[PDB]
C-alpha cells in the first residue's frame, strides 16, 4: 500500500501532523515501472512487453516495461511513421535512466531514418543518402514530375543538422508519452531550438 | 465514507414532502433520475401522501407493479416506487386520465395542479447547456435532462422552451431578459412568479436577478433559480394557489379571517 496521502508530511511550520485514518484505498500508489529497450536483444529475446493494470473507474491502463519500437513525428513536414528507436541519450531527469536506457516521457533518443528517408524521397525526389547522388528524378520532364521540382525548390533548407542526421542513419527525437501509463512510446523529431541545445549537452557531455 | 449512501431518514427527508414527522424512521429515497434528490417527488410520495390513491406501503407496490400500468410521467410509463418527478412535469393517472403539473407552492411545498387534456400536451422545459457535438451537429439540454438534436439556433443557454409532448416537438421559446415572467424553482423565494427586472452578471462566479409581480414586490435571486414561465407578462401555465404570489402572514389573516 505505497500511499501518497499528504498526511505523512509536516505542515508549513514543519510540526509533525496527526493521523486517525488508516491508509485508505483510494490513495493507491502503484509500483514504479522502469522502461528499457530491446535495441540489444543480447539476452532479451521477447522484444516488447506491456502489462495492463486494472485502474480505478474500471478501465485498464497498459504499462510499458520493455520496448523496441515507437512512433515519431517530424515537426516540420507533418509526417509520422512507426520506427525502431535506437539508444537513449541524456534523460535530463537523471543520467541513470540513460545508463539503463529507461524510457521517461521526456527522454531524448535516436531512431531509424528509413521511414522518413523513404518518404522524403517519394515526395521531393531527394534520398538524403551520401550527398553526391543527391537527387533521383524521372527521365522525361513534361508530366507530374514537375511537382517534385516545385516542392524541392521550396528551398527545403532542412537545417545543416537535420541533413547530417539522415545520412548517419541515426535521428534525434524526444518522447511525449508515459510508458508506465499508456504502454506506448511516442516522440517528436528534434529540431531548431532544442536540437541545437540538446546536442550541445551531448557534445560537451562526452568531450 | 464506506461507499455511497443508500437510504433516507424520516427526519432528513425534505420539508417539501410535507412529511409525517411521527411517521416511521425512513422515507422512500428518490431514485437517481431526471431531477436532483431534494428537487423531486418520488411516486410513492405522490400517490400515498399526495393524491391519497394509495395508502399503506404495499398499496403502491400494487399500483406500479400491476400489469395494467396506472402511472404516466411525461407520456411514458413508470413503475418505480421512487421515480423523481420534478418541476414542470406532467403526470397522468391512467385509470382515471388525470393530468398533473409538478409545481412548488408559494410556501415551497410540492403541489399537484390539475391540467386539461389541453396543457397535458405541452410541458415547459428550461435550457441546461447548449453546444455542438458529433459530426457538426447542435445539441441543447433541458433541466428535465432532455437531450435535444437540431434545435432552433436562436436559443441562448438560459432559455425556456414549450414542449409538445405528443409530437416531441418544440414551439415558441423565450430567453430570460429584462421584461419576462418567471417561476423560481428553489430558494428563500421559491414558488413566486413575477416580471424580470434586470440581470446583473458579476462573473466572479455568481450572477443575480431582480423581479416584480402582482402587488409589485421586489424579488432577489440567483439566475440558476429563475425559470422563465413565459415571455412578456403572459404566463404559459396555470399556477397553483391562485397566482404565484405569497402573502404576509398579515395578508393571509386579513384574507381568510379578515382581521
Amino acid at each position: 500500500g505505497i500511499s501518497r496521502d499528504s498526511k505523512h508530511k509536516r505542515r508549513a511550520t514543519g510540526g509533525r501532523m496527526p493521523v486517525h485514518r488508516k491508509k485508505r484505498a483510494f490513495e493507491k500508489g502503484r509500483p514504479i515501472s522502469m522502461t528499457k529497450l530491446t535495441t540489444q536483444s543480447t539476452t532479451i529475446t521477447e522484444k516488447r512487453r506491456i502489462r495492463p493494470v486494472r485502474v480505478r473507474g474500471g478501465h485498464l491502463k497498459f504499462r510499458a516495461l520493455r520496448l523496441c519500437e515507437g512512433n515519431f513525428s517530424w515537426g516540420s513536414e507533418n509526417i509520422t511513421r512507426k520506427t525502431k528507436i535506437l539508444d537513449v541519450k541524456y534523460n535530463a531527469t537523471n543520467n541513470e535512466l540513460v545508463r539503463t536506457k529507461t524510457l521517461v516521457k521526456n527522454s531524448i533518443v535516436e531512431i531509424d531514418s528509413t521511414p522518413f528517408r523513404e518518404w522524403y524521397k517519394l515526395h521531393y525526389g531527394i534520398d538524403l543518402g551520401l550527398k553526391k547522388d543527391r537527387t533521383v528524378l524521372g527521365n522525361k520532364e513534361k508530366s507530374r514530375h514537375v511537382q517534385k521540382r516545385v516542392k524541392r525548390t521550396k528551398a527545403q533548407a532542412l537545417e545543416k543538422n537535420i541533413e547530417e542526421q539522415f545520412v548517419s542513419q541515426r535521428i534525434l527525437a524526444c518522447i511525449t508519452s508515459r510508458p508506465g501509463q499508456s504502454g506506448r512510446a511516442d516522440g517528436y523529431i528534434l529540431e531548431g531550438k532544442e536540437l541545437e541545445f540538446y546536442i550541445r549537452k551531448l557534445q560537451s557531455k562526452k568531450k | 465514507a464506506r461507499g455511497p449512501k443508500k437510504h433516507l431518514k424520516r427526519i432528513n427527508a425534505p420539508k417539501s414532502w410535507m412529511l409525517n414527522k411521527l411517521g416511521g424512521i425512513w422515507a422512500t429515497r428518490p431514485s437517481q433520475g431526471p431531477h436532483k434528490l431534494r428537487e423531486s417527488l418520488p411516486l410513492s410520495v405522490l400517490l400515498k401522501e399526495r393524491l391519497n390513491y394509495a395508502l399503506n406501503g404495499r398499496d403502491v407496490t400494487l399500483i406500479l407493479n400491476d400489469k395494467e400500468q396506472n402511472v404516466f410521467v411525461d407520456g411514458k410509463v413508470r413503475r418505480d416506487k421512487g421515480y423523481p418527478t420534478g418541476l414542470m412535469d406532467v403526470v397522468r393517472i391512467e385509470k382515471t386520465d388525470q393530468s398533473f403539473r409538478i409545481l412548488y407552492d408559494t410556501k415551497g411545498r410540492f403541489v399537484l395542479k390539475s391540467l386539461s387534456k389541453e396543457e397535458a400536451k405541452y410541458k415547459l422545459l428550461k435550457v441546461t447547456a447548449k453546444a455542438i457535438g458529433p459530426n457538426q451537429i447542435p445539441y441543447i439540454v433541458t433541466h428535465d435532462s432532455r437531450t435535444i438534436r437540431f434545435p432552433n439556433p436562436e436559443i441562448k443557454i438560459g432559455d425556456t422552451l414549450k414542449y409538445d409532448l405528443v409530437n416531441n416537438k418544440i414551439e415558441n421559446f423565450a430567453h430570460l431578459e429584462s421584461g419576462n415572467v418567471c417561476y423560481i424553482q428553489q430558494g428563500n423565494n421559491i414558488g413566486r412568479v413575477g416580471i424580470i427586472q434586470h440581470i446583473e452578471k458579476h462573473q466572479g462566479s455568481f450572477d443575480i436577478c431582480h423581479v416584480k409581480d402582482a402587488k409589485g414586490n421586489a424579488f432577489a435571486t440567483r439566475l440558476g433559480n429563475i425559470f422563465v414561465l413565459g415571455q412578456g407578462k403572459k404566463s404559459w401555465i396555470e399556477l397553483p394557489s391562485g397566482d404565484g404570489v405569497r402573502e404576509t402572514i398579515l395578508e393571509e389573516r386579513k384574507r381568510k379571517f379578515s382581521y
Binding site: 499528504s6 508530511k9 508549513a12 515537426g75 516540420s76 541524456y90 535530463a92 521526456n106 528551398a155 533548407a157 537545417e159 517528436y188 528534434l190 529540431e191 531548431g192 531550438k193 532544442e194 536540437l195 541545445f197 540538446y198 550541445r200 549537452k201 | 462573473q203 466572479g204 462566479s205
Partner: protein, 157 residues
C-alpha cells in the same frame, strides 16, 4: 541560449511551435503562448514579449483561475518565482465585544512577467494546487513604499 538552457534541461511552451515555424518563412514566426484569464484583468505587456518559460504562469499556460481572488501585502522576495503575502485582518471577541489583530500568510506564485519588490501590495487569483503551499498566482501587482519593517506594517487593506 540564456532563457532557454539556464541550468535546467530545456524550456519550451504549451504550444509546441518553434522549429516548425521555419515552415512559414514569411509572416511572423516568433509565436509564444498568448492568453487572457479575463475576469476583469489586463494581460501584462511584459508577459507577451518575454522569453520566459513558466508553466505555472496564468498567461503563459493552461493554468486557470477560479473563485477566490486576493489582495495582500508582500513579505518575502526569496524563493524561485514564489512569494509570501501577509493579510491583516481584525477578529471580533464575543465577550469583551472588541477585536484583536491577526495575520494569515499566503504562498503565491509569480510569473516572471511582473517584477516583484518587497513590501508591496499584490493581487492573487485562485489557481489549482501548484505545490504543498502554493494555491495562488499573482495577477496584478501594485508597487508600494513602506520605510522599513514589513512586519511592523499592518494595514486593513
Amino acid at each position: 541560449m540564456d532563457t532557454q538552457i539556464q541550468r535546467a534541461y530545456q524550456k519550451q511552451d504549451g504550444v509546441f511551435l518553434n522549429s516548425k515555424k521555419l515552415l512559414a518563412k514569411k509572416t511572423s514566426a516568433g509565436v509564444r503562448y498568448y492568453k487572457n484569464i479575463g475576469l476583469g484583468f489586463k494581460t501584462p505587456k511584459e508577459a507577451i514579449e518575454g522569453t520566459y518559460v513558466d508553466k505555472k504562469c496564468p498567461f503563459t499556460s493552461n493554468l486557470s483561475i477560479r473563485g477566490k481572488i486576493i489582495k495582500g501585502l508582500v513579505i518575502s522576495t526569496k524563493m524561485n518565482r514564489t512569494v509570501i503575502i501577509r493579510r491583516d485582518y481584525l477578529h471580533y471577541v464575543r465577550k469583551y465585544n472588541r477585536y484583536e489583530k491577526r495575520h494569515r500568510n499566503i504562498p503565491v506564485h509569480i510569473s516572471p512577467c511582473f517584477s516583484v519588490k518587497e513590501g508591496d501590495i499584490l493581487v492573487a487569483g485562485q489557481c489549482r494546487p501548484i505545490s504543498k503551499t502554493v494555491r495562488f498566482n499573482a495577477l496584478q501587482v501594485v508597487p508600494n513604499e513602506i520605510i522599513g519593517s514589513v512586519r511592523k506594517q499592518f494595514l486593513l487593506f
